mmCIF file of C-alpha atoms (C1' of nucleotides) and ligand atoms in Angstrom:
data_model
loop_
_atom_site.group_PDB
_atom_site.id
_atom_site.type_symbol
_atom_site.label_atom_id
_atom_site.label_comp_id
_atom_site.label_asym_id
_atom_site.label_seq_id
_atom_site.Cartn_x
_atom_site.Cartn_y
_atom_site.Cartn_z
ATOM 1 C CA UNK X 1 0.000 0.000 0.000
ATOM 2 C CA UNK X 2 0.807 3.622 -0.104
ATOM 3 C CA UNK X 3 1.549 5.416 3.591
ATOM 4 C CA UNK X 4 0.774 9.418 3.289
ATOM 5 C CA UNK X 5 2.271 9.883 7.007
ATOM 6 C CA UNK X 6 3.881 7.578 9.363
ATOM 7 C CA UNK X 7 5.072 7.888 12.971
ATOM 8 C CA UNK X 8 6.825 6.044 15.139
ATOM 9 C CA UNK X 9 8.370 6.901 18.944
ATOM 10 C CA UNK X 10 10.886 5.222 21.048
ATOM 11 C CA UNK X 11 11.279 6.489 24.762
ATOM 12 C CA UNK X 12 14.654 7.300 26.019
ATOM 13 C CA UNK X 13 15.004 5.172 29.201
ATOM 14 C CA UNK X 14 16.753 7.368 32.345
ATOM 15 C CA UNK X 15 20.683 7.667 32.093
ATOM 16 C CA UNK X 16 20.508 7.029 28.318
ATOM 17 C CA UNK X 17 21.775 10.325 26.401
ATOM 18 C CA UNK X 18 21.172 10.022 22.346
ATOM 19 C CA UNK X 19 22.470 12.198 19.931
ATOM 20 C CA UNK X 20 21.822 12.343 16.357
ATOM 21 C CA UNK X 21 24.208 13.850 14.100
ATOM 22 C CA UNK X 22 23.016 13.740 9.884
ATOM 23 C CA UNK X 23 26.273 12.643 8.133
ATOM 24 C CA UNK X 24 24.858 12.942 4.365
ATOM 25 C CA UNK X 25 21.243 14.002 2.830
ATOM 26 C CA UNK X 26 19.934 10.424 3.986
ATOM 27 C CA UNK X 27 22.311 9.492 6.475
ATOM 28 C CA UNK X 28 22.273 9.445 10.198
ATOM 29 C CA UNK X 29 24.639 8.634 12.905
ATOM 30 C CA UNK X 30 23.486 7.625 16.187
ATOM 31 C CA UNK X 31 25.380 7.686 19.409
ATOM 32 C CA UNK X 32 23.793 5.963 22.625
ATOM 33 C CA UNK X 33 25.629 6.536 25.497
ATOM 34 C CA UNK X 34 24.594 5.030 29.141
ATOM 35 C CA UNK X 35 25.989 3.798 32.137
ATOM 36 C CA UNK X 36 27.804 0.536 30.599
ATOM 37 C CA UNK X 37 29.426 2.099 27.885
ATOM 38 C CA UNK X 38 28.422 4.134 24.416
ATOM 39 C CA UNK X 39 27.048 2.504 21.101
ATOM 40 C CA UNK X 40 27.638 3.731 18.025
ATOM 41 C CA UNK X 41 25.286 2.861 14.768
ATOM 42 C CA UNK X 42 24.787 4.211 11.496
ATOM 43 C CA UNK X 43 21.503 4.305 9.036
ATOM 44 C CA UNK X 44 23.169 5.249 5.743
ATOM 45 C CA UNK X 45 20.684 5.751 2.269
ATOM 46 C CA UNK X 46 17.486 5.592 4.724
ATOM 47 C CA UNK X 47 13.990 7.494 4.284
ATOM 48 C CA UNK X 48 13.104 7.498 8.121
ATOM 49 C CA UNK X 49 13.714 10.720 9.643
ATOM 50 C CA UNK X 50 15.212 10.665 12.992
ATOM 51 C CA UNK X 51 14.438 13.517 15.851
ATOM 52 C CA UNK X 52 14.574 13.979 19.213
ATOM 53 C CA UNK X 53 11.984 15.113 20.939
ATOM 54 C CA UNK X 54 12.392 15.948 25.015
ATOM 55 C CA UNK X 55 13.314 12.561 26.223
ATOM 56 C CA UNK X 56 12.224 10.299 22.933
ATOM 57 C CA UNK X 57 13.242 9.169 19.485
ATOM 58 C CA UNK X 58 10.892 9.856 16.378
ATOM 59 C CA UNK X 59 10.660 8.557 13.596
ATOM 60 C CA UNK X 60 8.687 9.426 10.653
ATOM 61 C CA UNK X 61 8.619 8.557 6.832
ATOM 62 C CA UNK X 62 6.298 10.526 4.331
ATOM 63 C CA UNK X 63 5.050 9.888 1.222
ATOM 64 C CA UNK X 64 6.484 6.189 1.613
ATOM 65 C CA UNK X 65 5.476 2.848 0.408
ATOM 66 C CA UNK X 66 5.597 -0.697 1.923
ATOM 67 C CA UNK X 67 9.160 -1.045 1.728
ATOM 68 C CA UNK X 68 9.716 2.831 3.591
ATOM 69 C CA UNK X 69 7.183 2.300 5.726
ATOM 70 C CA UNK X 70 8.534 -1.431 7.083
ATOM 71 C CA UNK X 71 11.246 0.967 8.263
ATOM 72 C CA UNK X 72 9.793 2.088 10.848
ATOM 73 C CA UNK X 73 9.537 -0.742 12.885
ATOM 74 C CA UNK X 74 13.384 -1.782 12.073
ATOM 75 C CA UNK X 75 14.272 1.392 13.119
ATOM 76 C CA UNK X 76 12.242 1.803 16.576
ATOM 77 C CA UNK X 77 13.585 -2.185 17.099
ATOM 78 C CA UNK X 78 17.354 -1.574 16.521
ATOM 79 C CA UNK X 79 17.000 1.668 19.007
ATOM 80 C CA UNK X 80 15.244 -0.345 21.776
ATOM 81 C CA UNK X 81 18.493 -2.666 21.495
ATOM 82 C CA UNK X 82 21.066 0.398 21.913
ATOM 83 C CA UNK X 83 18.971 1.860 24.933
ATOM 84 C CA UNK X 84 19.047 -1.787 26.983
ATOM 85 C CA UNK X 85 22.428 -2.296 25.526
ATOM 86 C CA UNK X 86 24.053 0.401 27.761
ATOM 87 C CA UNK X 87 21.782 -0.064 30.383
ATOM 88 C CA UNK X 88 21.358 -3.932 30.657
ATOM 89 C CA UNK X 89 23.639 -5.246 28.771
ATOM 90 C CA UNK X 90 23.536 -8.584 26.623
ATOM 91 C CA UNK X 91 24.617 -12.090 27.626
ATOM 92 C CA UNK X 92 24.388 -14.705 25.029
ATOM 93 C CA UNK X 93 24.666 -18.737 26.429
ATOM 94 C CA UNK X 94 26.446 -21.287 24.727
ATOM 95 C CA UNK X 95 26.447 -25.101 25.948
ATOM 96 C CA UNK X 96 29.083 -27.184 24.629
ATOM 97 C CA UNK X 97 27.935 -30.592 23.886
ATOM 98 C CA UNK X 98 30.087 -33.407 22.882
ATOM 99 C CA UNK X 99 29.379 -37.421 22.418
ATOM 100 C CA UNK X 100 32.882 -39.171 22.637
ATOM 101 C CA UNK X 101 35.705 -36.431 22.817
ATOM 102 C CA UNK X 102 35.334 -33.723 25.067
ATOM 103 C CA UNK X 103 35.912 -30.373 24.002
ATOM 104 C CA UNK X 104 38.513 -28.338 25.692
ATOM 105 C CA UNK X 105 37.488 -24.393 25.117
ATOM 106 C CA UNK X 106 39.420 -21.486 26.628
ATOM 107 C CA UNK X 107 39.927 -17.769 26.244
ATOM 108 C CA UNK X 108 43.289 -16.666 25.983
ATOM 109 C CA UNK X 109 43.835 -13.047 25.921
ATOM 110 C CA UNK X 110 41.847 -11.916 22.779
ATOM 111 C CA UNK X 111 41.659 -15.353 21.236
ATOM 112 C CA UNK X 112 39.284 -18.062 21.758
ATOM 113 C CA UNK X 113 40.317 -21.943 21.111
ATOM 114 C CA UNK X 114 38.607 -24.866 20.967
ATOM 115 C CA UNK X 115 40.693 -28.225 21.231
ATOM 116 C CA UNK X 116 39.676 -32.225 20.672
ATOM 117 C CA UNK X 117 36.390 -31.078 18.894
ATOM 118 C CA UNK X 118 35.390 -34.974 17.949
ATOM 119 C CA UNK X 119 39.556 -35.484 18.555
ATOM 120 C CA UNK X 120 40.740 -33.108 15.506
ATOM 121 C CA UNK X 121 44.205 -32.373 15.940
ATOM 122 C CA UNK X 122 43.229 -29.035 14.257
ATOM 123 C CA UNK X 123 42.341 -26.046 16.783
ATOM 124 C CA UNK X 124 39.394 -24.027 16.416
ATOM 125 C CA UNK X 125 40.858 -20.613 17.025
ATOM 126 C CA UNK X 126 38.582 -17.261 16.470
ATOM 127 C CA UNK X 127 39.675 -13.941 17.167
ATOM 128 C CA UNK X 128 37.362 -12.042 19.866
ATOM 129 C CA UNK X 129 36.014 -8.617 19.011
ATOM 130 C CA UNK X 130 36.452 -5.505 20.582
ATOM 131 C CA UNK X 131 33.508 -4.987 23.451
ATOM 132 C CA UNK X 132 32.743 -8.756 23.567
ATOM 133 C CA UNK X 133 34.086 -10.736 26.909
ATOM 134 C CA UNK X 134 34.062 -14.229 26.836
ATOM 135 C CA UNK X 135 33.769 -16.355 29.899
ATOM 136 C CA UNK X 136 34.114 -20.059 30.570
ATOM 137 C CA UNK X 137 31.680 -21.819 33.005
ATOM 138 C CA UNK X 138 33.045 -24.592 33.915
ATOM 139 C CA UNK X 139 33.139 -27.434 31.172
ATOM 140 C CA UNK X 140 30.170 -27.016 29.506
ATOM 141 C CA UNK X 141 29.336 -23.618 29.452
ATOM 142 C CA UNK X 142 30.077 -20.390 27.418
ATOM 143 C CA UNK X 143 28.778 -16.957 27.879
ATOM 144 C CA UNK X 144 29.604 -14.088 25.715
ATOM 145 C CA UNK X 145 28.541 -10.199 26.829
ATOM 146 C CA UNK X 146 28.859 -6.859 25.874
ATOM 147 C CA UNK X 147 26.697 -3.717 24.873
ATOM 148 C CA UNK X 148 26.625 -4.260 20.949
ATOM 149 C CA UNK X 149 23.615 -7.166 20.978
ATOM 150 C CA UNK X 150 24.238 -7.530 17.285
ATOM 151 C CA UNK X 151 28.236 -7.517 17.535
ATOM 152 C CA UNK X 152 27.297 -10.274 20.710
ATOM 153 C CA UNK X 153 24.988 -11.964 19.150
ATOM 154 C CA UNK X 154 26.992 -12.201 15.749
ATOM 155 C CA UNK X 155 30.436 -13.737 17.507
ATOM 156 C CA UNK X 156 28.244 -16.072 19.434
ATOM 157 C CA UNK X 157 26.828 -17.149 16.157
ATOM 158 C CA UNK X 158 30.190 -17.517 14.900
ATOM 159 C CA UNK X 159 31.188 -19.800 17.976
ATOM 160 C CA UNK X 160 28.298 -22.434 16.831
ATOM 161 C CA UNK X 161 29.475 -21.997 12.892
ATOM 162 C CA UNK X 162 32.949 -22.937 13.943
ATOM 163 C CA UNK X 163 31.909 -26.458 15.159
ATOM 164 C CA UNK X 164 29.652 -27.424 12.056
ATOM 165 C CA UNK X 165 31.628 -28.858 9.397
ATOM 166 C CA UNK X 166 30.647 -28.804 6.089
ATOM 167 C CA UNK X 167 30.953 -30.343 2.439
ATOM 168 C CA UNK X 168 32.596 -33.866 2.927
ATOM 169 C CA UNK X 169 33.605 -33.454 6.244
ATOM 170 C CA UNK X 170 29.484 -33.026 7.480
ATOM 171 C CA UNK X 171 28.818 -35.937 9.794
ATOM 172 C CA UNK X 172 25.494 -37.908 9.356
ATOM 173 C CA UNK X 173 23.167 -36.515 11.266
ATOM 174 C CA UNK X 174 21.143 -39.594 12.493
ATOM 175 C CA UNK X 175 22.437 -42.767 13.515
ATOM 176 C CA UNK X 176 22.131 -46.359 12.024
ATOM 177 C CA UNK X 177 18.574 -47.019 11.450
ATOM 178 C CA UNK X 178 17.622 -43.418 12.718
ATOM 179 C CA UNK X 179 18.992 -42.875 16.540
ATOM 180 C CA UNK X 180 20.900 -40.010 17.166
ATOM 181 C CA UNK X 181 24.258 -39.620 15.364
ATOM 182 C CA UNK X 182 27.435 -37.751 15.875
ATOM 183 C CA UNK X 183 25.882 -34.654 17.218
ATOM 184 C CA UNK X 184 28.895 -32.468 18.677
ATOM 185 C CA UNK X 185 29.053 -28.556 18.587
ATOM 186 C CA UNK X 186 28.602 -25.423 20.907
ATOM 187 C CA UNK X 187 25.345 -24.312 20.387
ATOM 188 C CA UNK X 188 23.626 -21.049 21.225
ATOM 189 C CA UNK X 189 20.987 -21.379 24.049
ATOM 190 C CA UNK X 190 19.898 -18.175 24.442
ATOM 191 C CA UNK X 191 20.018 -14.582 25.452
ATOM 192 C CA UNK X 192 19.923 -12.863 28.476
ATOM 193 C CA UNK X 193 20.816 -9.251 30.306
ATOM 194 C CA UNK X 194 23.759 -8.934 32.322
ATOM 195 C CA UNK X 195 22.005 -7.266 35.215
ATOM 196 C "C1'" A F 1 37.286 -42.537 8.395
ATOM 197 C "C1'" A F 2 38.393 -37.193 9.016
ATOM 198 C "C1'" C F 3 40.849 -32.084 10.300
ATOM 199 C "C1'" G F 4 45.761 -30.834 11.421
ATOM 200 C "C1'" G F 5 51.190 -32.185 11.107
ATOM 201 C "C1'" G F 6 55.621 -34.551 8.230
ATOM 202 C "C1'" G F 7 57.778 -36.648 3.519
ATOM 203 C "C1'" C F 8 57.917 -37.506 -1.878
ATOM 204 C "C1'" G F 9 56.304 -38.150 -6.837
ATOM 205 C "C1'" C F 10 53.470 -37.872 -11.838
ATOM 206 C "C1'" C F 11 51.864 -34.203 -15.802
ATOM 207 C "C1'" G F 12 52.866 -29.251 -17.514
ATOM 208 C "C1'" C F 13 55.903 -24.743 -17.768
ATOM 209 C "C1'" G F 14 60.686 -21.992 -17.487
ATOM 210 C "C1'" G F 15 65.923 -22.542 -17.313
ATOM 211 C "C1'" C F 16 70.891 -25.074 -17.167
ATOM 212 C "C1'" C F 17 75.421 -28.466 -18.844
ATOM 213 C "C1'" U F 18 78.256 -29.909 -12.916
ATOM 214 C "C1'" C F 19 77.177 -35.330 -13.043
ATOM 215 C "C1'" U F 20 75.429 -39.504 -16.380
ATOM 216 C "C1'" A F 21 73.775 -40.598 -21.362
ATOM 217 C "C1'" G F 22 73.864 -39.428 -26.897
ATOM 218 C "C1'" U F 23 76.642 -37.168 -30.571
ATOM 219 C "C1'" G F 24 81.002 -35.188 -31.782
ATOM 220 C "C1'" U F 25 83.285 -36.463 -40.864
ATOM 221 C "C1'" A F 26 87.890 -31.253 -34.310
ATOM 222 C "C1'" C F 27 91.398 -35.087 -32.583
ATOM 223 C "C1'" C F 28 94.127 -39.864 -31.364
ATOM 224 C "C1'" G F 29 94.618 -45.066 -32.321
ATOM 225 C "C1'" G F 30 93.713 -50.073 -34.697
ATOM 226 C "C1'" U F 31 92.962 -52.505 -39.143
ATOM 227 C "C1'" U F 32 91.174 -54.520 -44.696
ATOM 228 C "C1'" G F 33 92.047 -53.963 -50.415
ATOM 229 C "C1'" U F 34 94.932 -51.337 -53.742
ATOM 230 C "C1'" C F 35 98.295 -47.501 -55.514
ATOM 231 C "C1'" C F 36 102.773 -44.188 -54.426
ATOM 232 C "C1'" G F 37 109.710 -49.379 -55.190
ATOM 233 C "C1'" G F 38 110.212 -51.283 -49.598
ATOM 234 C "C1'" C F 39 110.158 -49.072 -44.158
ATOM 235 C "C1'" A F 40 108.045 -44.572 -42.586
ATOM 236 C "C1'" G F 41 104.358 -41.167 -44.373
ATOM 237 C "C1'" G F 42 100.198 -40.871 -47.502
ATOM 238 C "C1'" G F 43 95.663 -41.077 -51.738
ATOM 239 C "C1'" C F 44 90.901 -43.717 -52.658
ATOM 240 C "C1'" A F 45 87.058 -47.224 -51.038
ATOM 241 C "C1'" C F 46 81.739 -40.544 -50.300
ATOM 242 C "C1'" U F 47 85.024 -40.519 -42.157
ATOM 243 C "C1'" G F 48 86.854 -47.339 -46.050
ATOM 244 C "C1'" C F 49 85.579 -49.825 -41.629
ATOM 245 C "C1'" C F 50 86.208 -50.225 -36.193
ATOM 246 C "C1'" G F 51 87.395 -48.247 -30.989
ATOM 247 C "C1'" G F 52 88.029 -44.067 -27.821
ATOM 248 C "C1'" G F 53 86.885 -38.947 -27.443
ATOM 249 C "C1'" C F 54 87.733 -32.429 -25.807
ATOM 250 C "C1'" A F 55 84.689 -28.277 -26.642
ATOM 251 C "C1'" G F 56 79.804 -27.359 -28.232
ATOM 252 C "C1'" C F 57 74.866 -28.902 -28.507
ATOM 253 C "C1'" C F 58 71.567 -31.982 -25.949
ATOM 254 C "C1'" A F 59 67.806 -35.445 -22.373
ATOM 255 C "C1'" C F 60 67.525 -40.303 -20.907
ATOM 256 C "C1'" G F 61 70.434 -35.684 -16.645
ATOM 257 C "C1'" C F 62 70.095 -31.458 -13.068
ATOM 258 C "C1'" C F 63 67.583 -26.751 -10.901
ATOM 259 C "C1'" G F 64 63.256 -23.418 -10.119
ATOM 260 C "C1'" U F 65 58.026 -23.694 -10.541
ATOM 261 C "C1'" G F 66 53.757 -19.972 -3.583
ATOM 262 C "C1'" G F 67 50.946 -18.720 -0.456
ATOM 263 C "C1'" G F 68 47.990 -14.631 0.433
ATOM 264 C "C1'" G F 69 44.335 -10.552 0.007
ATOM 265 C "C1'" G F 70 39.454 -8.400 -2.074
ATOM 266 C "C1'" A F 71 34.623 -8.662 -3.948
ATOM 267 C "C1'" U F 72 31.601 -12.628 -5.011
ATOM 268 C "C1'" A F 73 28.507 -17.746 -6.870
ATOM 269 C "C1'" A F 74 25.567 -21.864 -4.896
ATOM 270 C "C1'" C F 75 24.220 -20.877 -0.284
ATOM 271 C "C1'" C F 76 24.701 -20.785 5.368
ATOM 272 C "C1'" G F 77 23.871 -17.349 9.383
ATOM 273 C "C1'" C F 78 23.123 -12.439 12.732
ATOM 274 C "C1'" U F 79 20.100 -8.516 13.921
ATOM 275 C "C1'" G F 80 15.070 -7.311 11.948
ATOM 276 C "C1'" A F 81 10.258 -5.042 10.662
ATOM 277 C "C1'" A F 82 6.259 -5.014 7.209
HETATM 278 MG MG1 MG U 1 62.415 -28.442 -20.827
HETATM 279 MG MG1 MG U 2 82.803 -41.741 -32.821
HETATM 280 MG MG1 MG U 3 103.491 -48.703 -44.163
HETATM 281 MG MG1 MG U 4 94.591 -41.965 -57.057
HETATM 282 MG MG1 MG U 5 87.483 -40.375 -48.390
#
RNA sequence: AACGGGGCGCCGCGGCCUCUAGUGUACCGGUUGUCCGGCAGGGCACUGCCGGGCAGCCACGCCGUGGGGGAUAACCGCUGAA
């Protein structure tokens, strides 16, 4: 359909200072700053105007069709993120599961390795972004935080892709005549705030 | 079975001549028939034939011949509204 006028408001939480700075005729920078640190995003080529208005975000597109006005939501979504990222925080789980060889994960300095992942003499070995701390909980447990919920959420995805193998190396799935086969990998569990 | 780690070929490409192999009517030797009287030296038999062989050329010989980065394909995912 066709959208004459469109609105949308997100409301600044307390602590949370947001400033808005236009960096081209469409393009907006947007810098979230709380009490666990200060975000950073950009919204380059976009239609939805961004304001502040006494303690809220607004966001409006005019004369816009479906794909302006679906916008809107993204927008008022991907803020609502920033303002609980320097507030709350994210925490992404990850729970290592393994079937005959146990994985041996640990962070060292800025680098995460995995060793013995179904007894590879190959180490997993991925290189841990700026703003993302990764913690070990005991054996079996991984949990990955920072303010950035996409840059968190992204490495944690990365964590899982590390452990499935692919083309010729992909391990059946099922077992022999359809029990569980060689299932091993970290896999994400779920999210969570820090506080 | 596999990833990772170590070692080496085959095919192709580019060079090289130290080794080995081929050639080598440069060169040295042996020897057949005849002719120059004999010896020695030599002509011809299209290097007469046979053996060896420097240089040069050469392969059947030796040497070199890789990893990375970027954007992507098939797609796999993150966040994410309509
Ligand atoms: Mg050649
Ligand atoms: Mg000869
Ligand atoms: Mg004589
Ligand atoms: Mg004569
Ligand atoms: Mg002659």
């Amino acid at each position: 359909m066709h959208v004459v006028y469109a609105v949308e408001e997100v409301p600044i939480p307390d602590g949370v200072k947001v400033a808005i700075e236009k960096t081209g005729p469409f393009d907006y920078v947007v810098k979230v700053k709380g009490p666990l640190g200060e975000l950073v995003k950009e919204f380059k080529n976009t239609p939805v105007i961004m304001s502040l208005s006494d303690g809220k975000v607004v966001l409006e597109v005019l004369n816009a069709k479906k794909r302006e006005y679906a916008l809107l939501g993204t927008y008022k979504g991907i803020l609502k993120n920033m303002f609980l990222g320097v507030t709350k925080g994210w925490r992404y789980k990850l729970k290592v599961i393994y079937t005959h060889f146990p994985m041996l994960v640990k962070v060292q300095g800025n680098q995460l390795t995995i060793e013995n992942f179904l007894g590879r003499k190959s180490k997993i070995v991925l290189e841990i972004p700026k703003g993302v701390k990764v913690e070990v909980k005991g054996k079996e447990d991984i949990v990955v935080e920072g303010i950035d919920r996409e840059l968190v959420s992204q490495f944690a995805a990365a964590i899982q892709a590390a452990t499935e193998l692919r083309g010729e190396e992909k391990p059946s799935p099922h077992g022999r005549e359809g029990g569980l086969g060689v299932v091993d990998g970290i896999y994400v569990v779920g999210y969570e705030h820090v506080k």
